[PDB]
JSON list of C-alpha atoms and ligand atoms in Angstrom, two decimals:
[
{"chain": "A", "resi": 1, "resn": "UNK", "atom": "CA", "xyz": [18.48, 29.89, -11.86]},
{"chain": "A", "resi": 2, "resn": "UNK", "atom": "CA", "xyz": [15.43, 31.26, -10.00]},
{"chain": "A", "resi": 3, "resn": "UNK", "atom": "CA", "xyz": [14.23, 29.29, -6.80]},
{"chain": "A", "resi": 4, "resn": "UNK", "atom": "CA", "xyz": [11.75, 26.61, -7.72]},
{"chain": "A", "resi": 5, "resn": "UNK", "atom": "CA", "xyz": [10.30, 23.38, -6.54]},
{"chain": "A", "resi": 6, "resn": "UNK", "atom": "CA", "xyz": [8.68, 20.67, -8.55]},
{"chain": "A", "resi": 7, "resn": "UNK", "atom": "CA", "xyz": [6.57, 17.65, -7.49]},
{"chain": "A", "resi": 8, "resn": "UNK", "atom": "CA", "xyz": [5.57, 14.72, -9.36]},
{"chain": "A", "resi": 9, "resn": "UNK", "atom": "CA", "xyz": [3.24, 12.99, -9.44]},
{"chain": "A", "resi": 10, "resn": "UNK", "atom": "CA", "xyz": [1.02, 15.95, -8.24]},
{"chain": "A", "resi": 11, "resn": "UNK", "atom": "CA", "xyz": [-2.32, 14.75, -9.16]},
{"chain": "A", "resi": 12, "resn": "UNK", "atom": "CA", "xyz": [-4.23, 11.41, -8.94]},
{"chain": "A", "resi": 13, "resn": "UNK", "atom": "CA", "xyz": [-2.42, 10.80, -5.64]},
{"chain": "A", "resi": 14, "resn": "UNK", "atom": "CA", "xyz": [-3.57, 8.29, -2.99]},
{"chain": "A", "resi": 15, "resn": "UNK", "atom": "CA", "xyz": [-2.90, 8.21, 0.74]},
{"chain": "A", "resi": 16, "resn": "UNK", "atom": "CA", "xyz": [0.61, 6.62, 0.78]},
{"chain": "A", "resi": 17, "resn": "UNK", "atom": "CA", "xyz": [1.62, 7.66, -2.76]},
{"chain": "A", "resi": 18, "resn": "UNK", "atom": "CA", "xyz": [5.33, 8.39, -2.82]},
{"chain": "A", "resi": 19, "resn": "UNK", "atom": "CA", "xyz": [6.11, 11.61, -4.73]},
{"chain": "A", "resi": 20, "resn": "UNK", "atom": "CA", "xyz": [9.41, 13.05, -5.97]},
{"chain": "A", "resi": 21, "resn": "UNK", "atom": "CA", "xyz": [10.02, 16.57, -4.62]},
{"chain": "A", "resi": 22, "resn": "UNK", "atom": "CA", "xyz": [12.78, 18.46, -6.42]},
{"chain": "A", "resi": 23, "resn": "UNK", "atom": "CA", "xyz": [14.35, 21.91, -5.82]},
{"chain": "A", "resi": 24, "resn": "UNK", "atom": "CA", "xyz": [16.46, 24.26, -7.82]},
{"chain": "A", "resi": 25, "resn": "UNK", "atom": "CA", "xyz": [18.03, 27.74, -7.40]},
{"chain": "A", "resi": 26, "resn": "UNK", "atom": "CA", "xyz": [18.16, 27.02, -3.70]},
{"chain": "A", "resi": 27, "resn": "UNK", "atom": "CA", "xyz": [20.62, 28.07, -1.05]},
{"chain": "A", "resi": 28, "resn": "UNK", "atom": "CA", "xyz": [23.85, 26.01, -1.93]},
{"chain": "A", "resi": 29, "resn": "UNK", "atom": "CA", "xyz": [24.61, 23.61, 0.98]},
{"chain": "A", "resi": 30, "resn": "UNK", "atom": "CA", "xyz": [21.43, 24.57, 2.96]},
{"chain": "A", "resi": 31, "resn": "UNK", "atom": "CA", "xyz": [19.38, 21.83, 4.66]},
{"chain": "A", "resi": 32, "resn": "UNK", "atom": "CA", "xyz": [15.66, 22.12, 3.51]},
{"chain": "A", "resi": 33, "resn": "UNK", "atom": "CA", "xyz": [12.75, 20.34, 5.21]},
{"chain": "A", "resi": 34, "resn": "UNK", "atom": "CA", "xyz": [10.36, 18.57, 2.75]},
{"chain": "A", "resi": 35, "resn": "UNK", "atom": "CA", "xyz": [6.68, 18.41, 4.10]},
{"chain": "A", "resi": 36, "resn": "UNK", "atom": "CA", "xyz": [3.04, 18.53, 2.99]},
{"chain": "A", "resi": 37, "resn": "UNK", "atom": "CA", "xyz": [1.11, 21.62, 3.81]},
{"chain": "A", "resi": 38, "resn": "UNK", "atom": "CA", "xyz": [-2.50, 22.57, 3.94]},
{"chain": "A", "resi": 39, "resn": "UNK", "atom": "CA", "xyz": [-4.24, 26.06, 4.33]},
{"chain": "A", "resi": 40, "resn": "UNK", "atom": "CA", "xyz": [-6.44, 25.38, 7.30]},
{"chain": "A", "resi": 41, "resn": "UNK", "atom": "CA", "xyz": [-7.65, 28.77, 7.23]},
{"chain": "A", "resi": 42, "resn": "UNK", "atom": "CA", "xyz": [-7.15, 32.17, 5.63]},
{"chain": "A", "resi": 43, "resn": "UNK", "atom": "CA", "xyz": [-3.27, 32.96, 6.09]},
{"chain": "A", "resi": 44, "resn": "UNK", "atom": "CA", "xyz": [-2.90, 29.79, 8.17]},
{"chain": "A", "resi": 45, "resn": "UNK", "atom": "CA", "xyz": [-1.13, 26.71, 7.13]},
{"chain": "A", "resi": 46, "resn": "UNK", "atom": "CA", "xyz": [-0.53, 23.39, 8.85]},
{"chain": "A", "resi": 47, "resn": "UNK", "atom": "CA", "xyz": [1.89, 20.52, 7.91]},
{"chain": "A", "resi": 48, "resn": "UNK", "atom": "CA", "xyz": [2.27, 16.85, 8.50]},
{"chain": "A", "resi": 49, "resn": "UNK", "atom": "CA", "xyz": [5.43, 16.16, 10.59]},
{"chain": "A", "resi": 50, "resn": "UNK", "atom": "CA", "xyz": [4.70, 12.43, 10.63]},
{"chain": "A", "resi": 51, "resn": "UNK", "atom": "CA", "xyz": [5.94, 12.05, 7.03]},
{"chain": "A", "resi": 52, "resn": "UNK", "atom": "CA", "xyz": [8.35, 14.96, 6.70]},
{"chain": "A", "resi": 53, "resn": "UNK", "atom": "CA", "xyz": [11.86, 14.64, 5.47]},
{"chain": "A", "resi": 54, "resn": "UNK", "atom": "CA", "xyz": [14.91, 16.64, 4.83]},
{"chain": "A", "resi": 55, "resn": "UNK", "atom": "CA", "xyz": [17.41, 17.19, 1.99]},
{"chain": "A", "resi": 56, "resn": "UNK", "atom": "CA", "xyz": [20.52, 19.31, 1.70]},
{"chain": "A", "resi": 57, "resn": "UNK", "atom": "CA", "xyz": [20.86, 21.48, -1.63]},
{"chain": "A", "resi": 58, "resn": "UNK", "atom": "CA", "xyz": [24.12, 20.66, -3.40]},
{"chain": "A", "resi": 59, "resn": "UNK", "atom": "CA", "xyz": [26.92, 23.14, -4.51]},
{"chain": "A", "resi": 60, "resn": "UNK", "atom": "CA", "xyz": [24.53, 24.02, -7.26]},
{"chain": "A", "resi": 61, "resn": "UNK", "atom": "CA", "xyz": [21.44, 24.78, -5.38]},
{"chain": "A", "resi": 62, "resn": "UNK", "atom": "CA", "xyz": [19.74, 21.62, -6.46]},
{"chain": "A", "resi": 63, "resn": "UNK", "atom": "CA", "xyz": [18.13, 18.99, -4.16]},
{"chain": "A", "resi": 64, "resn": "UNK", "atom": "CA", "xyz": [15.66, 16.11, -4.69]},
{"chain": "A", "resi": 65, "resn": "UNK", "atom": "CA", "xyz": [14.21, 13.58, -2.40]},
{"chain": "A", "resi": 66, "resn": "UNK", "atom": "CA", "xyz": [10.98, 11.46, -2.05]},
{"chain": "A", "resi": 67, "resn": "UNK", "atom": "CA", "xyz": [7.89, 12.20, 0.09]},
{"chain": "A", "resi": 68, "resn": "UNK", "atom": "CA", "xyz": [4.94, 10.10, 1.05]},
{"chain": "A", "resi": 69, "resn": "UNK", "atom": "CA", "xyz": [1.66, 12.08, 0.85]},
{"chain": "A", "resi": 70, "resn": "UNK", "atom": "CA", "xyz": [-1.45, 11.72, 2.94]},
{"chain": "A", "resi": 71, "resn": "UNK", "atom": "CA", "xyz": [-5.04, 12.39, 1.94]},
{"chain": "A", "resi": 72, "resn": "UNK", "atom": "CA", "xyz": [-5.88, 13.36, 5.38]},
{"chain": "A", "resi": 73, "resn": "UNK", "atom": "CA", "xyz": [-3.38, 14.01, 8.37]},
{"chain": "A", "resi": 74, "resn": "UNK", "atom": "CA", "xyz": [-3.07, 15.66, 11.84]},
{"chain": "A", "resi": 75, "resn": "UNK", "atom": "CA", "xyz": [-1.88, 19.13, 10.92]},
{"chain": "A", "resi": 76, "resn": "UNK", "atom": "CA", "xyz": [0.46, 21.13, 12.97]},
{"chain": "A", "resi": 77, "resn": "UNK", "atom": "CA", "xyz": [1.16, 24.88, 12.74]},
{"chain": "A", "resi": 78, "resn": "UNK", "atom": "CA", "xyz": [4.71, 26.39, 12.01]},
{"chain": "A", "resi": 79, "resn": "UNK", "atom": "CA", "xyz": [5.44, 26.50, 15.65]},
{"chain": "A", "resi": 80, "resn": "UNK", "atom": "CA", "xyz": [4.53, 22.91, 16.39]},
{"chain": "A", "resi": 81, "resn": "UNK", "atom": "CA", "xyz": [1.14, 23.74, 17.83]},
{"chain": "A", "resi": 82, "resn": "UNK", "atom": "CA", "xyz": [-1.44, 20.85, 17.04]},
{"chain": "A", "resi": 83, "resn": "UNK", "atom": "CA", "xyz": [-4.08, 22.12, 14.71]},
{"chain": "A", "resi": 84, "resn": "UNK", "atom": "CA", "xyz": [-6.21, 19.17, 13.96]},
{"chain": "A", "resi": 85, "resn": "UNK", "atom": "CA", "xyz": [-7.33, 16.84, 11.17]},
{"chain": "A", "resi": 86, "resn": "UNK", "atom": "CA", "xyz": [-6.74, 18.14, 7.56]},
{"chain": "A", "resi": 87, "resn": "UNK", "atom": "CA", "xyz": [-8.51, 16.55, 4.65]},
{"chain": "A", "resi": 88, "resn": "UNK", "atom": "CA", "xyz": [-6.74, 17.39, 1.38]},
{"chain": "A", "resi": 89, "resn": "UNK", "atom": "CA", "xyz": [-9.80, 16.12, -0.47]},
{"chain": "A", "resi": 90, "resn": "UNK", "atom": "CA", "xyz": [-11.21, 19.69, 0.19]},
{"chain": "A", "resi": 91, "resn": "UNK", "atom": "CA", "xyz": [-8.39, 21.54, 1.81]},
{"chain": "A", "resi": 92, "resn": "UNK", "atom": "CA", "xyz": [-5.81, 23.14, -0.46]},
{"chain": "A", "resi": 93, "resn": "UNK", "atom": "CA", "xyz": [-2.70, 21.09, -0.01]},
{"chain": "A", "resi": 94, "resn": "UNK", "atom": "CA", "xyz": [0.80, 21.50, -1.28]},
{"chain": "A", "resi": 95, "resn": "UNK", "atom": "CA", "xyz": [4.31, 20.08, -0.93]},
{"chain": "A", "resi": 96, "resn": "UNK", "atom": "CA", "xyz": [7.11, 22.34, 0.03]},
{"chain": "A", "resi": 97, "resn": "UNK", "atom": "CA", "xyz": [10.62, 22.94, 0.78]},
{"chain": "A", "resi": 98, "resn": "UNK", "atom": "CA", "xyz": [11.64, 25.27, 3.58]},
{"chain": "A", "resi": 99, "resn": "UNK", "atom": "CA", "xyz": [14.95, 25.86, 5.36]},
{"chain": "A", "resi": 100, "resn": "UNK", "atom": "CA", "xyz": [15.49, 26.62, 9.19]},
{"chain": "A", "resi": 101, "resn": "UNK", "atom": "CA", "xyz": [14.35, 30.09, 8.89]},
{"chain": "A", "resi": 102, "resn": "UNK", "atom": "CA", "xyz": [11.16, 29.47, 6.93]},
{"chain": "A", "resi": 103, "resn": "UNK", "atom": "CA", "xyz": [12.64, 30.62, 3.55]},
{"chain": "A", "resi": 104, "resn": "UNK", "atom": "CA", "xyz": [12.33, 28.58, 0.21]},
{"chain": "A", "resi": 105, "resn": "UNK", "atom": "CA", "xyz": [10.46, 28.56, -3.02]},
{"chain": "A", "resi": 106, "resn": "UNK", "atom": "CA", "xyz": [6.76, 28.36, -3.69]},
{"chain": "A", "resi": 107, "resn": "UNK", "atom": "CA", "xyz": [5.07, 25.13, -2.77]},
{"chain": "A", "resi": 108, "resn": "UNK", "atom": "CA", "xyz": [3.46, 22.81, -5.37]},
{"chain": "A", "resi": 109, "resn": "UNK", "atom": "CA", "xyz": [-0.23, 22.17, -5.15]},
{"chain": "A", "resi": 110, "resn": "UNK", "atom": "CA", "xyz": [-1.40, 18.54, -5.04]},
{"chain": "A", "resi": 111, "resn": "UNK", "atom": "CA", "xyz": [-4.63, 16.76, -5.57]},
{"chain": "A", "resi": 112, "resn": "UNK", "atom": "CA", "xyz": [-5.95, 13.34, -4.68]},
{"chain": "A", "resi": 113, "resn": "UNK", "atom": "CA", "xyz": [-7.78, 10.61, -6.64]},
{"chain": "A", "resi": 114, "resn": "UNK", "atom": "CA", "xyz": [-11.67, 11.33, -6.72]},
{"chain": "A", "resi": 115, "resn": "UNK", "atom": "CA", "xyz": [-12.43, 7.66, -7.54]},
{"chain": "B", "resi": 201, "resn": "TH2", "atom": "C1", "xyz": [8.71, 27.76, 11.35]},
{"chain": "B", "resi": 201, "resn": "TH2", "atom": "C2", "xyz": [10.17, 27.43, 10.74]},
{"chain": "B", "resi": 201, "resn": "TH2", "atom": "C3", "xyz": [10.09, 27.19, 9.23]},
{"chain": "B", "resi": 201, "resn": "TH2", "atom": "C4", "xyz": [9.31, 25.83, 8.93]},
{"chain": "B", "resi": 201, "resn": "TH2", "atom": "C5", "xyz": [9.85, 24.60, 9.73]},
{"chain": "B", "resi": 201, "resn": "TH2", "atom": "C6", "xyz": [10.13, 24.99, 11.28]},
{"chain": "B", "resi": 201, "resn": "TH2", "atom": "C7", "xyz": [10.84, 23.84, 11.81]},
{"chain": "B", "resi": 201, "resn": "TH2", "atom": "C8", "xyz": [10.08, 22.55, 11.75]},
{"chain": "B", "resi": 201, "resn": "TH2", "atom": "C9", "xyz": [9.58, 22.19, 10.35]},
{"chain": "B", "resi": 201, "resn": "TH2", "atom": "C10", "xyz": [9.58, 20.86, 9.83]},
{"chain": "B", "resi": 201, "resn": "TH2", "atom": "C11", "xyz": [8.93, 20.45, 8.51]},
{"chain": "B", "resi": 201, "resn": "TH2", "atom": "O1", "xyz": [8.84, 19.34, 8.19]},
{"chain": "B", "resi": 201, "resn": "TH2", "atom": "C12", "xyz": [8.53, 21.65, 7.55]},
{"chain": "B", "resi": 201, "resn": "TH2", "atom": "C13", "xyz": [9.14, 23.01, 7.97]},
{"chain": "B", "resi": 201, "resn": "TH2", "atom": "C14", "xyz": [9.07, 23.42, 9.51]},
{"chain": "B", "resi": 201, "resn": "TH2", "atom": "C15", "xyz": [7.50, 23.65, 9.95]},
{"chain": "B", "resi": 201, "resn": "TH2", "atom": "C16", "xyz": [10.95, 26.24, 11.39]},
{"chain": "B", "resi": 201, "resn": "TH2", "atom": "C17", "xyz": [11.29, 26.80, 12.83]},
{"chain": "B", "resi": 201, "resn": "TH2", "atom": "C18", "xyz": [11.42, 28.24, 12.68]},
{"chain": "B", "resi": 201, "resn": "TH2", "atom": "C19", "xyz": [11.14, 28.57, 11.09]},
{"chain": "B", "resi": 201, "resn": "TH2", "atom": "O2", "xyz": [10.69, 29.97, 10.90]},
{"chain": "B", "resi": 201, "resn": "TH2", "atom": "C20", "xyz": [11.12, 30.82, 11.12]},
{"chain": "B", "resi": 201, "resn": "TH2", "atom": "O3", "xyz": [12.39, 31.14, 11.27]},
{"chain": "B", "resi": 201, "resn": "TH2", "atom": "C21", "xyz": [10.66, 32.23, 11.28]},
{"chain": "B", "resi": 201, "resn": "TH2", "atom": "C22", "xyz": [9.39, 32.16, 12.30]},
{"chain": "B", "resi": 201, "resn": "TH2", "atom": "C23", "xyz": [8.65, 33.43, 12.28]},
{"chain": "B", "resi": 201, "resn": "TH2", "atom": "O4", "xyz": [8.58, 34.11, 11.32]},
{"chain": "B", "resi": 201, "resn": "TH2", "atom": "O5", "xyz": [7.98, 33.71, 13.27]},
{"chain": "B", "resi": 202, "resn": "TH2", "atom": "C1", "xyz": [4.26, 28.36, 7.39]},
{"chain": "B", "resi": 202, "resn": "TH2", "atom": "C2", "xyz": [5.12, 29.33, 6.55]},
{"chain": "B", "resi": 202, "resn": "TH2", "atom": "C3", "xyz": [4.21, 30.28, 5.74]},
{"chain": "B", "resi": 202, "resn": "TH2", "atom": "C4", "xyz": [3.44, 29.44, 4.56]},
{"chain": "B", "resi": 202, "resn": "TH2", "atom": "C5", "xyz": [4.45, 28.71, 3.76]},
{"chain": "B", "resi": 202, "resn": "TH2", "atom": "C6", "xyz": [5.34, 27.61, 4.53]},
{"chain": "B", "resi": 202, "resn": "TH2", "atom": "C7", "xyz": [6.41, 26.99, 3.78]},
{"chain": "B", "resi": 202, "resn": "TH2", "atom": "C8", "xyz": [5.55, 26.23, 2.67]},
{"chain": "B", "resi": 202, "resn": "TH2", "atom": "C9", "xyz": [4.72, 27.24, 1.80]},
{"chain": "B", "resi": 202, "resn": "TH2", "atom": "C10", "xyz": [4.76, 27.23, 0.53]},
{"chain": "B", "resi": 202, "resn": "TH2", "atom": "C11", "xyz": [4.10, 28.13, -0.32]},
{"chain": "B", "resi": 202, "resn": "TH2", "atom": "O1", "xyz": [4.14, 28.29, -1.48]},
{"chain": "B", "resi": 202, "resn": "TH2", "atom": "C12", "xyz": [2.73, 28.79, 0.32]},
{"chain": "B", "resi": 202, "resn": "TH2", "atom": "C13", "xyz": [3.09, 29.14, 1.74]},
{"chain": "B", "resi": 202, "resn": "TH2", "atom": "C14", "xyz": [3.67, 28.02, 2.72]},
{"chain": "B", "resi": 202, "resn": "TH2", "atom": "C15", "xyz": [2.53, 27.13, 3.26]},
{"chain": "B", "resi": 202, "resn": "TH2", "atom": "C16", "xyz": [5.96, 28.46, 5.81]},
{"chain": "B", "resi": 202, "resn": "TH2", "atom": "C17", "xyz": [7.00, 27.84, 6.64]},
{"chain": "B", "resi": 202, "resn": "TH2", "atom": "C18", "xyz": [7.31, 28.86, 7.62]},
{"chain": "B", "resi": 202, "resn": "TH2", "atom": "C19", "xyz": [6.24, 29.93, 7.39]},
{"chain": "B", "resi": 202, "resn": "TH2", "atom": "O2", "xyz": [5.76, 30.61, 8.71]},
{"chain": "B", "resi": 202, "resn": "TH2", "atom": "C20", "xyz": [5.94, 31.35, 9.57]},
{"chain": "B", "resi": 202, "resn": "TH2", "atom": "O3", "xyz": [7.13, 31.61, 9.58]},
{"chain": "B", "resi": 202, "resn": "TH2", "atom": "C21", "xyz": [5.17, 32.10, 10.43]},
{"chain": "B", "resi": 202, "resn": "TH2", "atom": "C22", "xyz": [3.60, 31.75, 10.22]},
{"chain": "B", "resi": 202, "resn": "TH2", "atom": "C23", "xyz": [3.14, 32.63, 9.22]},
{"chain": "B", "resi": 202, "resn": "TH2", "atom": "O4", "xyz": [3.86, 33.18, 8.27]},
{"chain": "B", "resi": 202, "resn": "TH2", "atom": "O5", "xyz": [1.87, 32.91, 9.17]}
]
């Protein structure tokens, strides 16, 4: 089972929508942070610590939890440095699982309601 992550719903989201985040093929017994990310610049991503969460992969490398997404949020860099406001209406945002060393499967892109 290859490392993968699934997020649903992933489209038609609103600020406050709760999504299901699931991971498979992960490190058995490893704790994974669940967070919303955004590419704030080429090769630069910021996340939303204000609504982050954590989940530990089971003996089978599977995990699943919930996450509240935000249309816009105060983004922080990987090292905790404050970046600034991020608007997922335009910015490319995703939800991802990452362990303490920054490893984990590819994040899943998300989009918000346009109405
Ligand atoms: C940034 C990091 C991976 C992403 C982590 C971060 C700790 C805090 C954190 C909380 C979240 O909600 C998402 C993941 C994340 C933002 C980790 C601390 C070290 C780890 O990265 C590395 O081990 C390698 C660092 C590097 O390559 O310089
Ligand atoms: C931010 C990050 C690189 C970009 C990652 C992010 C985890 C979530 C994520 C999922 C993707 O599929 C796209 C990249 C990305 C958004 C990582 C968590 C730690 C890692 O970073 C660093 O270790 C050092 C900074 C860097 O690599 O530029």
